[PDB]
């Protein structure tokens, strides 16, 4: 993402093209054919790159929240807990991540 860093990251294959793209087309065609008996796969670096934009914000936001019961109620055989599950502005909550 840094324009400064792209000449030496792409040269050392830290961020750039896969081995199906920066190698010559004769060597990719060779490595596909001879793969079952002479593999050239681990000889060439493939850069996996995480995206910087439109994934994760930089504002103040907690990962896990804590929710005090609004109205609890204790019976001799049961216990009740009523919560406010407030999902704030521009957030999503998968209810699999929720628990008591």
């Amino acid at each position: 993402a840094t324009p400064s860093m792209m000449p030496q990251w792409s040269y050392m294959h830290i961020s750039g093209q896969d081995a199906s793209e920066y190698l010559s087309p004769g060597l990719v065609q060779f490595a596909r054919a001879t793969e079952t008996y002479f593999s050239l796969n681990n000889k060439f670096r493939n850069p996996t790159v995480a995206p910087t934009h439109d994934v994760t914000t930089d504002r103040s936001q907690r990962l896990t929240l804590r929710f005090i019961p609004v109205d609890r109620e204790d019976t001799a055989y049961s216990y009740k807990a009523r919560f406010t599950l407030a999902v704030g502005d521009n957030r999503v909550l998968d209810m699999a991540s929720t628990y008591f």
Binding site: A1, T2, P3, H53, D54, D58
Partner: protein, 288 residues
């Protein structure tokens, strides 16, 4: 006037009020009540304040200009960097001691000639700073004595390049040339980067003026700095140095409009609502 060594000496030695010696006319306008604003402000003073100003007016008190004449000289030596600001009290007592040992009618006249001489010398240095030419023209013309005036090929490109070389040091008062050992250099500003090596660049461009992967990056740094001072007709179109000087003028003009494009895109990416981390990286990868 804030950089005047005798105005600054009046703000450090002369009183901040209206005495009847330095300001005789301004206090006689107030004693005799012929002032425009508040004429009757002198009748409303006690006799200790009112009669002591009349006595200093009809027969005024003499004074020593010697501490004021020397302090105008010291505050000009401290301004033209001749002394340190820490030495401003050391050389003030050193000069007051000398004009006390050797005091005369000649010396007090000679201090009066020298406080008008240092008013000029402070202003002459501050004009020479904003012009910024005298230290550079004598050392760029000293460089061009070393370089030959007749290249074999492309003399038309060479004599307009070295004339545009005189145009950087003239039309930029901060830029300077000098020597450090064998070679000469060119800083584009005081205490700034982009220092080209003139003796290494002109031993690289020599042999490239008519050619029509081979340039040292300080020669290309020189061709970047000389680009806004070079016309399209100053060098050729097909010549490889002339082809780059047009290419570096387009690169400056594109970087001048990618600067204004950057200030537009990032302004409307904050209000529209984006990541402030990614608004500043996706813009540069769109502009670079």
């Amino acid at each position: 006037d804030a950089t005047d060594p005798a105005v600054r000496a009046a703000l450090q030695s002369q009183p901040s009020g209206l005495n009847s010696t330095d300001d005789w006319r301004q206090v006689m306008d107030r004693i005799m009540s012929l002032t425009a604003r508040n004429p009757d402000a002198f009748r409303q003073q006690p006799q200790a304040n009112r009669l002591s100003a009349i006595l200093e007016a009809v027969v005024p008190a003499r004074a020593n200009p010697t501490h004021e004449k020397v302090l105008a000289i010291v505050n000009a030596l401290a301004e033209n960097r001749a002394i340190r600001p820490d030495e401003a009290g050391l050389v003030y007592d050193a000069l007051l001691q000398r004009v006390a040992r050797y005091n005369s009618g000649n010396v007090q006249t000679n201090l009066d000639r020298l406080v008008g001489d240092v008013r000029e010398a402070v202003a002459q240095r501050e004009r020479a700073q904003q012009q910024g030419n005298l230290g550079s023209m004598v050392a760029l013309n000293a460089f061009l004595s070393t370089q030959p005036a007749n290249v074999p090929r492309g003399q038309e490109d060479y004599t307009n390049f070295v004339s545009a070389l005189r145009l950087m040091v003239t039309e930029t008062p901060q830029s300077e040339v000098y020597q450090s050992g064998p070679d000469y250099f060119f800083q584009t500003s005081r205490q700034g980067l982009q220092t080209v090596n003139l003796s290494q660049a002109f031993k690289n461009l020599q042999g490239l003026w008519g050619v029509r992967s081979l340039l040292t990056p300080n020669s290309r740094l020189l061709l970047l700095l000389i680009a806004p001072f070079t016309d399209s007709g100053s060098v050729s179109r097909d010549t490889y140095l002339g082809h780059l000087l047009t290419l570096y003028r387009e690169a400056i003009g594109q970087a001048h409009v990618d600067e204004h494009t950057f200030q537009e895109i990032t302004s409307v990416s904050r209000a529209l609502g984006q990541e402030d981390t990614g608004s500043l990286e996706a813009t540069l990868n769109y502009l670079l």
